[PDB]
Design a protein around this ligand. Structure first.
Ligand SMILES: Nc1nc2c(ncn2[C@@H]2O[C@H](COP(=O)(O)OP(=O)(O)OP(=O)(O)O)[C@@H](O)[C@H]2O)c(=O)[nH]1
Ligand SMILES: Nc1nc2c(ncn2[C@@H]2O[C@H](COP(=O)(O)OP(=O)(O)OP(=O)(O)O)[C@@H](O)[C@H]2O)c(=O)[nH]1
Ligand SMILES: Nc1ncnc2c1ncn2[C@@H]1O[C@H](COP(=O)(O)OP(=O)(O)OP(=O)(O)O)[C@@H](O)[C@H]1O
Ligand SMILES: C[S@@+](CC[C@H](N)C(=O)[O-])C[C@H]1O[C@@H](n2cnc3c(N)ncnc32)[C@H](O)[C@@H]1O
Ligand SMILES: C[S@@+](CC[C@H](N)C(=O)[O-])C[C@H]1O[C@@H](n2cnc3c(N)ncnc32)[C@H](O)[C@@H]1O
Ligand SMILES: C[S@@+](CC[C@H](N)C(=O)[O-])C[C@H]1O[C@@H](n2cnc3c(N)ncnc32)[C@H](O)[C@@H]1O
Ligand SMILES: [Mg+2]
Lengths: 1057, 288, 378, 76, 50
């Protein structure tokens, strides 16, 4: 598709009306209409009005009388706001009525009326010789042949040319015109040549490659800057046109070479003409910034003036030394020849040269316009690096980047009110177990739990996490934008938690509109409010699970036993206004009214009872463990005695403490208390504090004691740290292949030229990196990129430093972002619970692996996209056996990583387990490679097969992850599981198919029958803290509730030989 | 004061860039004529729109010239000396043949309409009495009448005197382009390699017997206390068409003097031109 | 040339903007949540829209006039590919919203307005990942090369590739590139919808063979072409999807979508640019395809119609006003009428009937009329 | 102008907007990424209308306001 | 400086006093001419002050 197909035409001639049409050309009878007769726009930002007449009127000189019309006075009358369409239409209409162009209507169909000379003569009020010639003989304006229209008047006047002023396009500006267009009497090509050659000896003149009305016309500039801005706009036009032509589309090019040909100009114009005629690749790639076009054009010229390509440089130089010559590619020239063959006497510019376009392979990425780029850096590339120098990142203002401490949660309102259960497992509590658990509980309470865990608990507050969601409900209710919801709905409870004023539905599912002028104050919530609310919802769901309404039943009561102001009692009182007779009271030692101020145990005289109790008692004072123990025992006892459904808090949920609770409940006469541990989503994500749930039932409870409960493990496994908590640093100096970085994030700015290099260097650490420039003019490019431990574990396996730097240099300068808006990164980004559990399991397995001695290799079967790479040490060889893994032989060879790329056979004969090897089977055992779930008996079968297969080799360690059965019992009873599910009895993590679960006892019994050594470990609190500290991940609430029961029920079998 | 603050924050002056964009100083400084030959321009006359200063832009539009840029054709045919590569002069007003309304007058009419609005708004802001306000308006419309009445003579007679004077031998430079935004006189000097250059235009400050101080007040006598041969037509003064010979013979005399005035200097400097010299060492690369 | 003149963007602009102007007045009202009219409304305006209840879009906030959505040429096509994947997942559906807890990837990306329109379309649906992922991608879309880097993990219920190398390149390079593209697209999703820039029989068969070489999954496949593609582009969307059975008759031969490309070849003649004729010769047969267009005295008008019946099968005419004596005429040249009239040298016409027209009998229209060089036909 | 009642958002926005348009701080933009602009001395010099010696020093040499090391901004 | 800050302060001062004296003037329903005379003397003061 080489040859251009374009239909050339003199568009400016086609615009000139037939003489018969001039009388009604203003359409005197009817109002001018927008979008047809005019275009008005008010740019409120620049506060500039802009009118633009359409049709023949787009070229209209205005007489000073026309300027005196009120229409042109309008923008002054409305300095700040748009001219109303009424006034604009009426003024433009009456002014339009005022205009009248001298003309003689005729019968011959061949005539056209010379609109230019007509309106021009009118504007000068018929004073100039053309104006006189016209007012005396209007019939002179009619023309058959377009050129003779002017020859008639040059002959009539005897003048060699007419200097005709240009109209401004907007009719509101009255600015003095940058140039004017002279029109020469040059009937033949020879006259055109002589005039051009004379023009090439006179200041500030230029011209088009061809002329409308087939009559020569030159532009004459008042100043050099005007010549520059004109040349710029024309170059842009010819580049857009040539771009459209090269795509091969048919196009109505009014003239084949749109750009101007300087005849006499300053140097800078000659540079514009030169790069302009190059049709440089940079325009198609949008490498230039068009907002400041001529500047960019001047800049482009300079590079072409000293271009690395000899061809382009000699070509540009040549064009610069012969500026008067028009340069064109051959594909243009054929269009010129076609245009000549159609109309033999057409005039076009005599002095021309046909250069061959020089190909250039540099395919720049680019995109002007808003949007930061979110890079995904490759581990490796074609480029080799040798000892790249450290790259400092600049200081950045808060106007560009800010770093908030924690990412606020995004979540549906219902998800906040969920909770998880953990039922008792042990059938008995033997005394030796009591002494052991007491020793662990006392040793643990005596020295406070991990300082890092307490840091995350004290930074990831639930109040701040839920504030952006809660206030959003306030702002919507405040506008009246909120509407339908059920009476008992959780969205209703959130609405109660947003605003201090009582709300009331006008009828079913319709909240009352606010009284006029009223803007109720948002409800005041302390950190524990929403948690108390979710405990209320929890007690409601526990009383019966099917319910959707959460209103209290009529004639019932609830007590929020720990209290200060306790906003929750007020919100709840407000929630139940439509329900008759519902006692609701806080009852703390620090209680303010409405709540009664009272100590627990209750004074013997005082009578207290309720259908529900929600204790949140917690001693602020430091105290002995025996005192805290007796206090919590008296608290749970008094809470259980006083209600049919207690929901006690436990600040120190050791196994010994909870078992002491169940034993003490056992000691009370005549009531068998069913019980369960619990954790709501509105708790602070990291708090180990756990809500025990007591309730009488007629039967004695089988398996009443706890052991290895998840909620308890969350607390007990945390212990005083051997290291200070890892504070997230903000790095600036990017060393080339260093591996000295503490977890945190790179953040800063570089020159746009250095930017491809800097991205290529930080791919060593960061797995991805957002970048952007603030504006087209500012040359600094901001970059943010958090450090991925997994990418460090990948890139530092060998000393080679490959990167896609060649690809990154396609970005400079427009290809890597723009964003005027301030951006706000968080030190702790959100991540889904499955991903977090995966990272915790990786921390557990990695710390476990570093202890192991003398093993040649790690083999992660089912490794996907090297997901387990964080686990393996930089030394020992890594292997993957996921069929779905993509191959990268350069990356594999460079990074010491074999990839089997075939399904792994679990059958013992097929098995080929090496000596001195660590076999990871993380989460792969539960699925077939095609993604369909494998039945649990088949899972147990393949585990048994891996066991017997590794039974023979002397040194090996398998890690078979799987899902324990008990979790399905718990999620059947829980609520807060936006991710995890229980479809038809199978776990359904993420988007994965539901998959049947193993029971831990049968698996352990099988491994004991095999005779192999094993140890069913699961990751604990310190592992969680390591994953969060390293990856820069805050937990989030729903994940905070679900994570313990989820983590406990993904056991990791650790076969060892 | 508000629009002024917004305006002068952009800058009291500007300079055109090599790319042709304007670049305003950002500074509020009083102008001096020392800046006339500088890169700097007064910022009032940039005619560049500003977001909040529209009244100032529009008021400065009143200062835009109503004339036209005639080319010096008769002065070319005579081969009269001209510093410009295409000689040209801005003639302040067009001839207005045959018109009922003078365009030059009608412009001034719109001008006083604008100024009327401005002076009136400033009047209601100062809460001044109606009578004085109407007196201002009356004096304005009176001016517009005097201006029409004079306008016929300024356009139909004075213009051919500017046009004829544009062709005179010694009027060798371009005076204007019509663009206040961008017109800067071309600045030649007589540079020499062995000395400092002499600018041809300089703020030498010599008043040349008061030639270079410009009283604007002079427009008042013109509008009000002066008569013209054309305005008088009800006596009909015949127009004067002065002989060429008086100015030509003068211009020639000057050209004759200053032509030969440099001659002895020219001859000697022509001889000595090769004589300027630099000290140079010649190291020898090879024996003998 | 036809592909570069008959752009789909310009073809659909008058319809799309009309949806904008109606929504802007608040004149638009009822529509279903998942309806195609809803998707068009999302494709018209930049602002998020929300129903106040069933089948009822919210009235605009007072004084607010949201900016129309910015669409490049490939936007609507990407949307129709989305609708296509929806209909392919099941055919009975009327709602086109994504199911909750699902994802889709628009693999070729720049700004990719379609990802934004689609994100906007599904606001009422919980949990729906939607991202572009091109090498030239701007945010929200991730910027990344294909094949995916080995470390990076990508998966979705749907993939809509539109990868296309701008650079000139060797055929073997383009072949290996498209193979890696289809392979990576199929591996990453249960329902890929890959573009094929050069849909030769060899290329598509290479695709099915390469899909055959992958272990353990039998990929059902079909060629596809959406209405929102440029009308003349031969570019074709192959549609991969796993099924339990091995597919009988998996290879292509003489497929229509392939024939659209393969039968096109370098021309023996330059493309025929449509001329605008003025001089009506009496029985000439020298006219290149195009159209007569001009004006004559009203007296000559019966004659001129009688002469051009030789070429044009029909001819609109009108005078601008009662006073203006010129009569404008437009008449495109029908090859069929030329093939009829030039069979013999006789030049009969109903000129006697046409002279019954002068002067009032052949049109009036003050309004400007706008003929096209390329008229619509079924 | 509003002794008793809140300033309407329209008037507050338009007035703050035009006053904001009026302010302009002397500065020299630069290419090096390490620079920061000494906002304190800039706006301070502006407030005194560039009369105090810091104001003079700034109006004459605005590039003095740019600083790499924060302390040297003042030592200069 | 082109504008003296010491003058500009006094300028705002007389703007305030102008508003005050004007309000006291309309309250006392005094004739327009005297009122404008007060304003004129104020602006005159502002000039003397610059
Ligand atoms: N005063 C006046 N100027 C005209 C008229 N028609 C064309 N021009 C001017 O003639 C100049 C050159 O004409 P063209 O070659 O047809 O168009 P162009 O150079 O691409 O410039 P534009 O089309 O205006 O952007 C333009 O700058 C126009 O402003 C007219 O009817 N009246
Ligand atoms: N005039 C002016 N004062 C500043 C600027 N920046 C800081 N200050 C003042 O410097 C004083 C001490 O600065 P800092 O130590 O940073 O802040 P601070 O002492 O805690 O006082 P504040 O942050 O203002 O509450 C503060 O009282 C500020 O008012 C500035 O840019 N201009
Ligand atoms: N882009 C260009 N195109 C053509 N000629 C150039 C270009 N740049 C410089 N030259 C020539 O080389 C000389 C270089 O001058 P110099 O670079 O010092 O200042 P300049 O002319 O303003 O160019 P620049 O804008 O690159 O500084 C000029 O005299 C000019 O003739
Ligand atoms: C951690 S606060 C939380 C209270 C409630 N969730 C709130 O803030 O609205 C627990 C409160 O219980 C109170 N408290 C401690 N011991 C108590 C006891 N023995 N009897 C009653 N209240 C007690 C404390 O004063 C403390 O303020
Ligand atoms: C459930 S996914 C994720 C596993 C785990 N999250 C990880 O990244 O290590 C397990 C992967 O193992 C692969 N796989 C499934 N069955 C396999 C088998 N029998 N042998 C080897 N790989 C298998 C699949 O391709 C799948 O992508
Ligand atoms: C024809 S464009 C269409 C993209 C999309 N339909 C749009 O415009 O919103 C295809 C894009 O894919 C990108 N691309 C080309 N090769 C690629 C590759 N190997 N991997 C990822 N993207 C690629 C190109 O940069 C090109 O911009
Ligand atoms: Mg044009």
């Amino acid at each position: 598709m080489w040859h251009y197909t374009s239909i050339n035409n003199d568009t400016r001639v086609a615009l000139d009306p037939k003489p018969n049409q001039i009388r009604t050309i203003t359409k005197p009878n009817t109002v001018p209409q927008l979008g047809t007769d005019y275009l008005y726009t008010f740019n409120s930002q620049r506060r500039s009005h802009t009118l633009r007449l359409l049709g023949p009127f787009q070229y209209f000189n205005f007489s000073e009388t026309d300027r005196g019309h009120p229409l042109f006075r309008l923008p002054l009358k409305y300095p700040s706001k748009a001219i109303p369409a009424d006034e604009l239409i009426d003024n433009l209409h009456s002014w339009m009525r005022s205009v009248h162009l001298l003309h003689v209507r005729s019968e011959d169909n061949t005539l056209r009326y010379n609109w230019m000379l007509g309106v021009y003569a009118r504007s000068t009020n018929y004073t100039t010789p053309v104006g006189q010639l016209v007012v005396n003989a209007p019939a002179i304006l009619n023309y058959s042949n377009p050129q003779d229209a002017f020859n008639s008047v040059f002959v009539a006047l005897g003048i060699d040319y007419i200097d005709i002023p240009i109209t401004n396009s907007n009719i509101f500006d009255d600015s003095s015109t940058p140039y004017n267009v002279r029109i020469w009497h040059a009937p033949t090509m020879t006259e055109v040549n002589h005039i051009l050659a004379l023009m090439r000896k006179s200041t500030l003149v230029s011209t088009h490659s061809s002329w409308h009305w087939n009559v020569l016309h030159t532009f004459h500039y008042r100043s050099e800057s005007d010549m520059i801005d004109h040349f710029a706009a024309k170059i842009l036009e010819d580049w857009r046109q040539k771009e459209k032509l090269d795509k091969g589309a048919l196009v109505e090019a009014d003239r084949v070479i749109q750009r101007l040909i300087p005849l006499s100009s300053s140097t800078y114009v000659q540079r514009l003409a030169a790069i302009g005629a190059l049709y440089p690749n940079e325009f198609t790639e949008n490498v230039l910034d068009l907002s400041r076009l001529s500047t960019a054009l001047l800049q482009l010229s300079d590079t072409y003036y000293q271009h690395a390509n000899d061809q382009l440089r000699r070509l540009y130089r040549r064009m610069y030394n012969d500026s008067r010559t028009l340069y064109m590619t051959q594909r243009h020239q054929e269009l010129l020849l076609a245009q000549i063959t159609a109309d033999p006497n057409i005039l076009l510019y005599p002095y021309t040269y046909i250069f061959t376009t020089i190909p250039t392979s540099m395919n720049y990425i680019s995109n002007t316009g808003q949007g930061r780029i979110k890079h995904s850096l490759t581990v490796t590339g074609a480029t080799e690096h040798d000892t790249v120098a450290d790259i400092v990142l600049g200081q950045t203002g808060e106007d560009v980047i800010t770093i908030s401490m924690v990412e606020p949660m995004s979540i549906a309102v219902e998800d906040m009110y969920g909770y998880v259960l953990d039922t008792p497992t042990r059938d008995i509590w033997p005394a030796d177990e009591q002494i052991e658990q007491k020793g662990d509980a006392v040793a643990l309470y005596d020295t406070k739990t991990s300082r890092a865990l307490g840091m995350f608990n004290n930074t990831v507050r639930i109040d701040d996490l839920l504030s952006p969601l809660l206030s959003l409900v306030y702002r919507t209710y405040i506008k009246g934008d909120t509407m339908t919801m059920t009476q008992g709905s959780l969205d209703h409870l959130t609405l109660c938690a947003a605003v201090d004023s009582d709300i009331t539905f006008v009828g079913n599912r319709m909240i009352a509109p606010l009284p006029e002028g009223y803007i109720p104050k948002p409800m005041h919530r302390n950190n524990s409010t929403m948690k108390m609310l979710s405990l209320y919802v929890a007690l409601k769901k526990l009383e019966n699970f099917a319910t959707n309404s959460y209103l209290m039943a009529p004639d019932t009561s609830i007590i929020l036993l720990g209290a200060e102001r306790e906003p929750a009692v007020n919100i709840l009182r407000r929630f139940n206004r439509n329900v008759s007779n519902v006692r609701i009271i806080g009852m703390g030692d620090r209680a303010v009214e409405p709540n009664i101020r009272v100590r627990v145990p209750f004074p013997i005289d005082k009578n207290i009872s309720a259908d529900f109790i929600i204790c949140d008692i917690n001693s602020y004072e430091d105290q002995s463990f025996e005192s805290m123990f007796s206090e919590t025992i008296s608290v749970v006892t008094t809470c259980a005695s006083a209600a049919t459904r207690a929901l006690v808090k436990i600040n120190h949920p050791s196994e010994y403490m909870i078992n002491s609770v169940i034993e003490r409940l056992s000691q009370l006469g005549g009531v068998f208390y069913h019980t369960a541990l619990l954790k709501t989503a509105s708790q602070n994500p990291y708090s180990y504090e756990t809500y025990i749930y007591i309730t009488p039932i007629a039967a004695a409870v089988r398996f009443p004691f706890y052991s290895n409960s998840a909620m308890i493990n969350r607390y007990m496994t945390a212990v005083a740290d051997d290291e200070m908590p890892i504070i997230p640093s903000i790095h600036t100096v990017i060393k080339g292949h260093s591996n000295t970085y503490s977890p945190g994030l790179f953040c800063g700015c570089v020159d746009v030229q250095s930017a491809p290099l800097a991205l290529s260097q930080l791919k060593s650490y960061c797995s991805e990196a957002t970048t952007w420039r603030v504006d087209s003019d500012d040359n600094l490019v901001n970059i943010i990129a958090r450090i991925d431990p997994a990418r460090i574990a990948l890139e530092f396996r060998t000393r080679s430093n490959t990167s896609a730097y060649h690809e990154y240099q396609r970005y400079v300068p427009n290809g890597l972002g723009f964003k005027v808006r301030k951006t706000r990164e968080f030190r702790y980004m959100h991540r889904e619970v499955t991903f977090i559990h995966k990272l915790m399991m990786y921390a557990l397995i990695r710390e476990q692996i570093s202890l192991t001695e003398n093993m040649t290799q790690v083999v992660s079967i089912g490794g996907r996209n090297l997901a387990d790479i964080s686990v393996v040490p930089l030394n020992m060889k890594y292997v993957v056996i996921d069929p779905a893994t993509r191959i990268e032989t350069l990356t594999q060879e460079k990074k010491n990583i074999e990839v089997q790329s075939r399904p792994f056979q679990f059958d013992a004969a097929n098995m080929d387990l090496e000596n001195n090897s660590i076999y990871l089977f993380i989460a792969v055992i539960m699925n077939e490679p095609n993604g369909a779930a494998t039945p649990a008996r088949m899972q147990m079968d393949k585990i048994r097969n891996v066991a017997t297969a590794m039974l023979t080799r002397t040194n090996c360690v398998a890690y078979i992850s799987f899902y324990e059965a008990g979790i399905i019992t718990r999620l059947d009873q829980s609520t807060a599981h936006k991710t995890i599910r229980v479809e038809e009895g199978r776990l359904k993590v993420a988007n994965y198919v539901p998959v049947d679960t193993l029971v831990e006892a049968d698996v352990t019994l099988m491994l004991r029958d095999i005779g192999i050594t094993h140890e069913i470990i699961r990751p604990s609190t310190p592992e969680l803290i390591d994953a969060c500290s390293n990856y820069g991940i805050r937990l989030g609430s729903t994940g905070g509730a679900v994570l313990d029961v989820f983590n406990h029920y993904s056991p990791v079998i650790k076969l060892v030989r | 004061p508000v629009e002024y603050g917004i305006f002068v924050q952009r800058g009291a002056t500007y300079t055109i860039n090599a790319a042709g964009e304007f670049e305003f100083s950002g500074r509020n400084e009083k102008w001096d004529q020392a800046l006339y030959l500088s890169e700097h321009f007064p910022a009032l006359f940039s005619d560049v729109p500003l977001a909040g200063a529209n009244t100032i832009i529009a008021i400065m539009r009143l200062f835009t010239p109503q004339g036209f840029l005639r080319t010096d054709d008769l002065a070319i045919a005579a081969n009269f000396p001209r510093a410009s590569r295409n000689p040209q002069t801005y003639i302040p007003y067009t001839n207005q043949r045959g018109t009922v309304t003078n365009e030059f007058a009608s412009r001034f009419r719109t001008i006083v309409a604008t100024l009327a609005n401005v002076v009136n708004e400033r009047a209601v802001q100062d809460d001044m009495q109606k009578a004085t306000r109407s007196c201002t308006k009356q004096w304005l419309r009176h001016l517009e009448t005097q201006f029409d009445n004079i306008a016929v003579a300024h356009t139909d007679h004075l213009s051919v005197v500017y046009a004829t004077m544009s062709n005179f031998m010694l009027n060798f430079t371009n005076n204007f382009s019509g663009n206040h935004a961008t017109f800067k006189p071309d600045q030649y000097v007589i540079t020499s390699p062995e000395g400092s250059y002499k600018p041809i235009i300089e703020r030498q400050g010599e008043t040349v017997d008061g030639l270079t101080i410009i009283d604007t007040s002079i427009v008042w006598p013109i509008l009000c206390q002066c008569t013209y041969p054309l305005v008088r037509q009800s006596i009909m003064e015949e127009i004067v068409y002065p002989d060429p010979s008086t100015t030509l013979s003068q211009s020639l005399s000057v050209a004759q003097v200053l032509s030969k005035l440099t001659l002895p200097d020219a001859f000697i400097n022509m001889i000595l031109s090769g004589g300027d010299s630099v000290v140079m060492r010649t190291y020898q690369t090879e024996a003998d």
